[PDB]
Ligand binder design. Structure first.
Ligand code: ADP
Ligand code: T4X
Ligand code: MG
Ligand code: MG
Length: 263
């Protein structure tokens, strides 16, 4: 049972669609953590309260080295605060802006830590449904951590996520409002793997309608530098039919993954 007075607040860490996440330290400990702030009026006006409940219940009951930790929460008259584990190395979005592209070793390592975290989620029938570079955080030893369980749910489901957000990481069945399962996170894993190596997602366009067309028709091409081992993995993950998508153990055991991942 914490309160705002139990914390010393520092600089902002990142911007959220419902308030910023700030760097903070607990007075009696000097322990460094992140405080996600959400404004009540915005939650109420949007009708996000039920999804915020799912975010807090699901995330707090997960324990994995590649998943961000949710310690607890508290609220006042105008805001809701989420006590998060601090990720010292920032996002994989920022790391991708610095390094225009990632090499095969970085990608295979990140995809390995990502598949390991998703298997733990999928073992509890939990699906993230919002895997994008801004929600992938780098912990103390440079390891990946899955954050923002804002759209996480228990499989199966049909709930609409982005009304007009980034469609780039969403599978065809999600953008079309169809029934979806664990296979949605496998599509996001392929888009992520393509983006890590190329610099941009495979269905990127300057119009929501063109992106919709390109993802529903699976219209993408690989630039010259993409290796046959990466081309195979990406093409296996990015299939229209969710049943034709591989299992997480086949991604972890893929020849191109095992040849470039850091044990
Ligand atoms: N634990 C954390 N450590 C460091 N930065 C974080 C942490 N949690 C969030 N951030 C930063 O805050 C941004 C928004 O946080 P996020 O939880 O994704 O909120 P929203 O769901 O509102 O988008 C992230 O993209 C990242 O830059
Ligand atoms: O008490 C209030 O006035 C209020 C107002 C609001 O808009 C949202 C919430 C709220 C939602 C989820 C939550 O986390 C959960 F309880 F689900 F874990 C904790 C507080 C509380
Ligand atoms: Mg986010
Ligand atoms: Mg969110």
């Amino acid at each position: 049972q914490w309160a705002l007075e139990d914390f010393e607040i520092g600089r902002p860490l990142g911007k959220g669609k419902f308030g910023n996440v700030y760097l903070a330290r607990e007075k009696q400990s000097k322990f460094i953590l992140a405080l996600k702030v959400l404004f009540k009026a915005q939650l109420e006006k949007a009708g996000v309260e039920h999804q915020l409940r799912r975010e807090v219940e699901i995330q707090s009951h997960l324990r994995h080295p590649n998943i961000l930790r949710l310690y607890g929460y508290f609220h006042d008259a105008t805001r809701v605060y989420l006590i998060l584990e601090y990720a010292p190395l920032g996002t994989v979005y920022r790391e991708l802006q610095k390094l225009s592209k990632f090499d095969e070793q970085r990608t295979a390592t990140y995809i390995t830590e990502l598949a390991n975290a998703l298997s733990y989620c999928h073992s509890k029938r939990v699906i993230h449904r919002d895997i994008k570079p801004e929600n992938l955080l780098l912990g103390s030893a440079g390891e990946l951590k899955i954050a923002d369980f804002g759209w996480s749910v228990h499989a199966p489901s049909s709930r609409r996520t982005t009304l007009c957000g980034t469609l780039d990481y969403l599978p065809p069945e999600m953008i079309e409002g169809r029934m979806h399962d664990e296979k949605v996170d496998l599509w996001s894993l392929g888009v992520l793997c393509y983006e890590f190596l190329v610099g941009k997602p495979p269905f990127e366009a300057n119009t929501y309608q063109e992106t919709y067309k390109r993802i529903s028709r699976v219209e993408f091409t690989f630039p010259d530098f993409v290796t046959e081992g990466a081309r195979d993995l990406i093409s296996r993950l990015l299939k229209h039919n969710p049943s034709q998508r591989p299992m997480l153990r086949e991604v972890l055991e893929h020849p191109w993954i095992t040849a470039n991942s850091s044990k």
